[PDB]
Amino acid sequence: EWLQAEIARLKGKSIVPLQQVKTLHDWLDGKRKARKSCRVVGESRTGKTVACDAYRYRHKPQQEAGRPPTVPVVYIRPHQKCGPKDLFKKITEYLKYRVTKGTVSDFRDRTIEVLKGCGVEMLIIDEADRLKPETFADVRDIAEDLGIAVVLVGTDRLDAVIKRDEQVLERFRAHLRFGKLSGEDFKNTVEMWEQMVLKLPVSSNLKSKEMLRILTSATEGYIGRLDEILREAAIRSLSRGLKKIDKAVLQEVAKEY
Amino acid sequence: EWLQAEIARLKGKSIVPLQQVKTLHDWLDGKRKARKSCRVVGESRTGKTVACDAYRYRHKPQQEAGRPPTVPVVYIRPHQKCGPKDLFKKITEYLKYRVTKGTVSDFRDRTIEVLKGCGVEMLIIDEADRLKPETFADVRDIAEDLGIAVVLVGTDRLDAVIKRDEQVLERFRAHLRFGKLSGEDFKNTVEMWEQMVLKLPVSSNLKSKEMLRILTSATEGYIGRLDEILREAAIRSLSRGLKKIDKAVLQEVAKEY
Amino acid sequence: EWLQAEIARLKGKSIVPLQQVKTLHDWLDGKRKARKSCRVVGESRTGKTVACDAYRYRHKPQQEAGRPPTVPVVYIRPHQKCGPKDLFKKITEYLKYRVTKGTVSDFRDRTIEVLKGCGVEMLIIDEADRLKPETFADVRDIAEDLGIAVVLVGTDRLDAVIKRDEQVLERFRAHLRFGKLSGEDFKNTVEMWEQMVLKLPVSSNLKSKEMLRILTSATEGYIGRLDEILREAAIRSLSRGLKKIDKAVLQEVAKEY
Amino acid sequence: EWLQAEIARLKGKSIVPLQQVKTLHDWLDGKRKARKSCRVVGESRTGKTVACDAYRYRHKPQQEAGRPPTVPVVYIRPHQKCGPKDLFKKITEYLKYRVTKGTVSDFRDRTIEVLKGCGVEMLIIDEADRLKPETFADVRDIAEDLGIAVVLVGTDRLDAVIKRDEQVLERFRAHLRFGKLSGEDFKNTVEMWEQMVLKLPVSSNLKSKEMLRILTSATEGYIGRLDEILREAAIRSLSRGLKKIDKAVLQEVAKEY
Amino acid sequence: WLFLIKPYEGESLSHFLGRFRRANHLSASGLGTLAGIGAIVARWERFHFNPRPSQQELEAIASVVEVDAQRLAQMLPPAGVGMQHEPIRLCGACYAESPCHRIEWQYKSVWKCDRHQLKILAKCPNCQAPFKMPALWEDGCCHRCRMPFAE
DNA sequence: TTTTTTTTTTTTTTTTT
DNA sequence: AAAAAAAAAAAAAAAAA
Ligand SMILES: Nc1ncnc2c1ncn2[C@@H]1O[C@H](COP(=O)(O)OP(=O)(O)OP(=O)(O)O)[C@@H](O)[C@H]1O
Ligand SMILES: Nc1ncnc2c1ncn2[C@@H]1O[C@H](COP(=O)(O)OP(=O)(O)OP(=O)(O)O)[C@@H](O)[C@H]1O
Ligand SMILES: Nc1ncnc2c1ncn2[C@@H]1O[C@H](COP(=O)(O)OP(=O)(O)OP(=O)(O)O)[C@@H](O)[C@H]1O
Ligand SMILES: [Mg+2]
Ligand SMILES: [Mg+2]
Ligand SMILES: [Mg+2]
């Protein structure tokens, strides 16, 4: 069924190139070469996590030799109230090594051992706010003992956590701010969105002012909302037998927010 | 009955040439010439044991005189909680000598006599973790006294056992990291699999993306799972009177995992 | 005495055909042909021991010649904290061989000798959780060395035991989820149970809604409880000189649960 | 074939004079004259056993008189879980006497007879830790009854065994601690190793800093690792048709540790 | 329950029991100990193969523990004739060609193998370790030095 | 929610006459 | 021919903070 094939596609996710994503990638590349540790802070739904995923794929692991693969970058997202056994477990599993039964003092050393040999030039910790304060000692140790940069991506709340520990705050002083979209950048993003993410049989012309003012009020510059508003509107429109998104559909969806 | 002849074949096993096996074979060849003792570590179902069997058949027994066979390589797999009488018994039987009744101190010496005379340049002990710690002394003695290199092939758990004894850990430091399949190597392996392992009257075209995404999700890069998923699907398909594996069969089998 | 003859019958057990039992038998038959390792799990008191017993009955041993009986399927239930000498002893006795005095290693070979010669295509180990972890090595060896598939039937707790050993977990990934009864399947089961299991002089009409709601609340879909509730109610009813089960009896019995 | 002649040589072993070896020989010579029991303890792969072999060859057996061959120093290495019949057997065979069938109480006395007559000034027991605690009584008896000094050479683990018995601990209090290489001693050892141990046609200049930092990281001061790294690199280099070891080869080998 | 070996009428009782163990996956000494445990007669020997109350035991064993009853009693020497008291000598060619020991080797006068016309041997050459097939097996491999016995 | 330790039976083993 | 006797490694448990 054509309709179901398009809905199964639309409900899915993809990465769209944006000025903010390229800016982060070039910035992280500098910190990687310099082995500099620095934070990434911005508002929710601005597309911070997705840009980090795209970076990992930019430089993929290399398997040329029969030796363990040299992973240039490690990306992890700690669970809630993450303790020191959990941080080490997740780093180790990311390198395809299985963790044996033992204590923190046992696979703390195994982590270092897996960290050596594998390149591990940069470690990106998303949801940095989700760490027990005691674990920041093991993060500093890694950043200090070996020449590895630690990104420490976080939301505005992360800064409230960082400032509670002098030694942690001093180390991660440098920062990058994600921001949100406004002005022409938003209009160009909508044009890019209809062309690359929406493939409806008939064009919707979402760049038009009459509907762009609606997308602007509904999204308020958050790439996460623009995604939701247009992705749901496309499924709701096709489900009615339409070949494009009607102004009435954009209004009907916007009213739910 | 044609159907039963194909099922009796499909339920069987065979060795498929792979990049990981050749790599393994020519690394061992270096250690053999240098008489170096090294370990080999890999995850379960990655095809570690099968590559070791293939190596033994690459380097077969040679007899050029009425003297005992010139056995170049010895491969053994110890039983659970293997003690020092059991290790010696299995080495001796492998070389085709009968073990007489006596104590460890009696056929410890008989083992040395039959390790000599035959070349026995290499000893591969699969599943090294299943061994009593006390037996690693008799393994070091062989490796130390005779010009013989010992492989010590095993899973991730073996490293937890090795690190409990300084003298074993230091002697066995060099390692090869057997791994799993990902990317193009997996797609090419599926094409090879359908090309050689499966001889179905009509081609299934398992390399196509619609079914390759299914084999990928079901397999997760483990050659052991790819072998199970496709081998059971072939028998289940033929049993229904099909000449090929239908997408529906691959899905039905994958759902069981 | 008629009353005592019926009580001596009612207190006994029998196998009732059910959709869940046929489903397991067809599934096991596939794994048998493919020689595939599998896993069977479900909740307590739900048609499983009887189903495994019924399967052995379905394909009884063949003894058409002077050679040992051709036993296709072996079913054993290990004792508590079963060790490696006990697993081998019980397999050997099942096949009708006497075990002589000796150690596990000599016993390792006699078990292999009698697993061979007879077909022994399948081994069903009920209550797999009650086994020492060390014994799973001897189970893998059998499954690996011989063309034999091992079912490993058990409860939810078995999964907690299996996940403690990588090499066991990977081998037995395929599973069937035995479940409980609900909806029409339960009503039809009560009608069948009354018809076959109960031969009372006068019909009780247990399918009726007034009493079916009681059997439903008392049973909660567990075939083990439906058999207890109705089997005790039948004996208690006859003992009062009744020719059928009164609603009052079903209520009186249900109150005890 | 020139290449095979060099590989057959390189795969072999030899003794290189070192400051640590001379230090031990002068120290043992003092204990020999004074007949003082003493200990030799150090880390694995530091070259403890080889220095002991060199000492035996320094003072070879002298047979210029009618009486049985006079061996001043006796060197034995006990088997695993060595008992009192095994210790006596190995001492007796070393001195070239055949052991007849009998009990411990029979050739305990024969051992004393052959310890006497020959000078037997010193007994060096390597791998002292792998001995039965009950056997230390027969060792003290020899050390006490006869004018013989016993070395008891071993690793760090030996001290854990010695401290379990008051009477053994006090008797063997004196000790010589083996040490690993660091600083200039390591650089001079690499220069010496290249000149005497390697006969390659073209000089590798391994003393150079660019490659010395690699040998240092790969070796960590253990003479056993320096031996392995350079001995395998020489064979691997010649096998490629090279006349010297390239930096690329030292890096390729180091990556395997 | 033991599986019956291929009968030969000229086989020694000792060999017959050794072949029962080989075929049934245990050691000869292990067979004797196990046989004694099964019977519980208390006079059953591990290595003295031919006793008089053991003839009763053998009859019982023949009639009950085998799939098909084998001739055990026929193999057994009673008092026997010209019986060697010392180690039993053997023919290497005979062991290797037919993995069985002949009853003839147990009796004096027969010093040469009648089939191969070579002298029967009592000790392994060079090793000079006396070689008794009932203790050291039908495989003809010397116990001390595991060298195959030569003529 | 983690960390000792801690105590005990069960055991496989090892030899000795 | 045979057995015993235990040294020692292992495995929850429950207590705090
Ligand atoms: N080279 C190969 N060719 C074909 N099949 C293979 C190969 N290697 C492994 N397999 C598959 O894996 C199974 C054998 O186990 P495998 O060697 O993969 O595990 P392993 O390497 O021994 O790991 P572990 O020792 O942990 O079990 C076979 O059933 C087979 O289908
Ligand atoms: N197919 C059947 N026909 C008749 N009675 C059955 C059937 N299945 C189960 N029962 C009833 O259930 C009881 C046995 O339950 P069963 O052993 O099947 O549960 P189980 O799942 O094996 O329990 P557990 O898994 O906890 O060991 C019997 O007394 C019997 O009356
Ligand atoms: N002077 C030397 N001459 C020869 N080989 C040496 C020397 N120094 C170190 N080695 C190498 O390093 C190793 C050191 O010897 P060995 O391992 O016997 O000492 P060890 O660490 O005391 O041994 P153990 O583990 O028994 O204590 C040898 O195998 C040898 O190849
Ligand atoms: Mg394997
Ligand atoms: Mg049950
Ligand atoms: Mg040494």
Count Cβ atoms within 10 A of the Cβ of residue B136 and give its class: 0-12 exposed, 13-18 middle, 19 or more buried.
buried
With a CB cutoff of 8 Å and minimum separation 6, the contacts of C212 are C187, C190, C206
Closest Cα in chain E, distance from residue C107 (Å): 9
Tell me how far apart the alpha carbons of residues A203 and A243 are, in angstroms, rounded to a whole number.
8
Strands of the sheet containing C39-41, edge to edge, are C153-154, C39-41, C175-177
Is residue C46 within 6 Å of ligand 2 at its C-beta?
yes
Full DSSP string of C12-34: S------HHHHHHHHHHHHHHHH
Which helix (H) or strand (E) segment is C75 a member of?
strand C73-76
- Using the structure block, give the residue that is written with the tokens 């760049």: A207
Which chains sit next to B, with 3 or more Cβ pairs under 8 A? A, C, D, E
Full DSSP string of A55-93: HHHHS--B--SSSPPB-SEEEE---TT--HHHHHHHHHH
Instruction: Check if the beta carbon of residue D155 is closer than 8 Å to that of residue D41.
Output: yes
Tell me how far apart the alpha carbons of residues B25 and B50 are, in angstroms, rounded to a whole number.
11
- Residue E104: phi and psi, rounded to 5, are -60, -30
Full DSSP string of D103-130: -HHHHHHHHHHHHTTS---EEEESSTTS
Instruction: Check if the beta carbon of residue D171 is closer than 8 Å to that of residue D37.
Output: yes
Shortest-distance Cα residue to atom 28 of ligand 1: B224
Pairing of strands D149-150, D153-154: unpaired
Helix H, strand E, coil C: the string for chain B is CHHHHHHHHHCCCCCCCCHHHHHHHHHHHHHHHHCCCCEEEECCCCCHHHHHHHHHHHCCCECCCCCCCECCEEEECCCCCCCHHHHHHHHHHHCCCCCCCCCHHHHHHHHHHHHCCCCCCEEEECCCCCCCHHHHHHHHHHHHHCCCEECCEECCHHHHHHCCCHHHHHHCCCEEEECCCCCHHHHHHHHHHHHHCCCCCCCCCCCCHHHHHHHHHHHCCCHHHHHHHHHHHHHHHHCCCCCCCCHHHHHHHHCCC
Q: Which two tokens stand for residue C238?
A: 């006859």
Tell me how far apart the alpha carbons of residues B224 and B180 are, in angstroms, rounded to a whole number.
10
CB contact under 8 A, D236 and B30: yes
Is residue B155 within 6 Å of ligand 1 at its C-beta?
yes
Q: Which residues pair with B125 in a beta bridge?
A: B76
Which chains sit next to C, with 3 or more Cβ pairs under 8 A? B, E
Is A84 near strand F, with its CB below 7 A from some atom of it? no
Instruction: Check if the beta carbon of residue A225 is closer than 8 Å to that of residue A216.
Output: no
Tell me how far apart the alpha carbons of residues A107 and A88 are, in angstroms, rounded to a whole number.
7
Instruction: Check if the beta carbon of residue B88 is closer than 8 Å to that of residue B107.
Output: yes
Q: Which residues pair with B75 in a beta bridge?
A: B124
Q: Which two tokens stand for residue D236?
A: 């691997």
Atom of ligand 2 nearest to the CA of C49: 22
Is the CB of C85 inside 8 Å of chain B's CB atoms? no
The long-range contacts involving A26-31, CB below 8 angstroms and separated by at least 24 positions, are A27/A176, A28/A55, A28/A122, A28/A151, A31/A122, A31/A149, A31/A151, A31/A174
Is the CB of D251 inside 8 Å of chain A's CB atoms? no
Is the CB of C3 inside 8 Å of chain B's CB atoms? no
SS3 D72: coil
Helices B48-58, B19-34: inter-axial angle, 10-degree rounding? 60
Is residue B251 within 6 Å of ligand 1 at its C-beta?
no
Q: Which two tokens stand for residue A189?
A: 């993003």
Q: Which two tokens stand for residue D243?
A: 């006349």
Chain D CA closest to residue B167: D44
Is E27 near strand G, with its CB below 7 A from some atom of it? no
Query: How far is CA B150 from each of CA A144, A240, B175, C79, E113, rounded to the nearest angstrom?
Result: 38, 70, 12, 39, 47
Pairing of strands C73-76, C39-41: unpaired
Is A14 near strand F, with its CB below 7 A from some atom of it? no
Q: Which residues pair with D149 in a beta bridge?
A: D122
Give the domain C19-177 fold.
Answer: Rossmann fold (3.40.50)
- Residue D46: phi and psi, rounded to 5, are -95, -10
With a CB cutoff of 8 Å and minimum separation 6, the contacts of C7 are C235, C238, C239
Atom of ligand 3 nearest to the CA of D178: 22
Strand G: which bases are under 7 Å from protein Cβ?
Answer: 1-2
The long-range contacts involving A10-15, CB below 8 angstroms and separated by at least 24 positions, are A10/A231, A10/A234, A10/A235, A10/A238, A11/A231, A11/A235, A14/A197, A15/A50, A15/A53, A15/A54
Instruction: Check if the beta carbon of residue C147 is closer than 8 Å to that of residue C35.
Output: yes
Tell me how far apart the alpha carbons of residues A52 and A28 are, in angstroms, rounded to a whole number.
10
Is residue B40 within 6 Å of ligand 1 at its C-beta?
no
The long-range contacts involving C128-132, CB below 8 angstroms and separated by at least 24 positions, are C128/C78, C128/C152, C128/C153, C128/C154, C128/C158, C128/C161, C129/C154, C129/C155, C129/C157, C129/C158, C129/C161, C130/C78, C130/C79, C130/C80, C130/C81, C130/C82, C131/C78, C131/C82, C131/C87, C132/C81, C132/C82, C132/C83, C132/C84
With a CB cutoff of 8 Å and minimum separation 6, the contacts of C82 are C130, C131, C132, C135
